Structure 1
Amino acid sequence: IQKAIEENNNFIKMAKEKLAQKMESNKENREAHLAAMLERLQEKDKHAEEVRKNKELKEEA
């Protein structure tokens, strides 16, 4: 009976951990995807501010 309790508890333990593991890795992965998406768009805005600044130097000619 002690063994039976031991197995039921371990099955619950392994399940609780593996689930928590999966849904921490998934949170990390989705955040890393959107973080890269925004950083790409923010890098676009730099090139946009640079294009505006390059027009401003030649109109001073």
Structure 2
Amino acid sequence: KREHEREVIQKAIEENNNFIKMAKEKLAQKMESNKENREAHLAAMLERLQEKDKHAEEVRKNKELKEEA
């Protein structure tokens, strides 16, 4: 009966520690997945705006090649 009493309290401790551990890991996974997603969305936006500048340059360039000077 003493060894069963030990196993119960050890199980209670293990259940608390495991609740902490699982919560810590889920949150860390959500935190990391969210940082990647948001940063990736900003990268796509800026990349589009970069293609705009690239395009504006090949337009100003296109006006040069229309010269008969």
Give the shorter-chain TM-score range: over 0.9
Equivalence for 2:66 = 58
Cα distance in 1, alignment partners of residues 44 and 51 from structure 2: 10
Cα distance in 1, alignment partners of residues 31 and 68 from structure 2: 56
| Structure 2 unmatched runs, 5+ | 1-8
Cα distance in 2, alignment partners of residues 60 and 17 from structure 1: 68
TM-score, structure 1 as length reference = 0.95
Cα distance in 2, alignment partners of residues 40 and 54 from structure 1: 21
Structure number with larger C-alpha Rg: 2
Matched, 1:41 2:17: no
Q: Which runs of 4+ in 1 moved over 2 A?
A: none
Percent of residue pairs bearing the same amino acid type:
100
Deviations 1:16-41 (A, max 9, x none): 00000000000000000000000000
In the TM superposition, residue 60 of structure 1 has moved relative to its aligned partner by 3.1
Cα distance in 2, alignment partners of residues 29 and 46 from structure 1: 26
In the TM superposition, residue 59 of structure 1 has moved relative to its aligned partner by 1.7
Report how many aligned residue pairs link the two structures.
Answer: 61
Cα distance in 1, alignment partners of residues 68 and 30 from structure 2: 58
Cα distance in 1, alignment partners of residues 66 and 13 from structure 2: 81
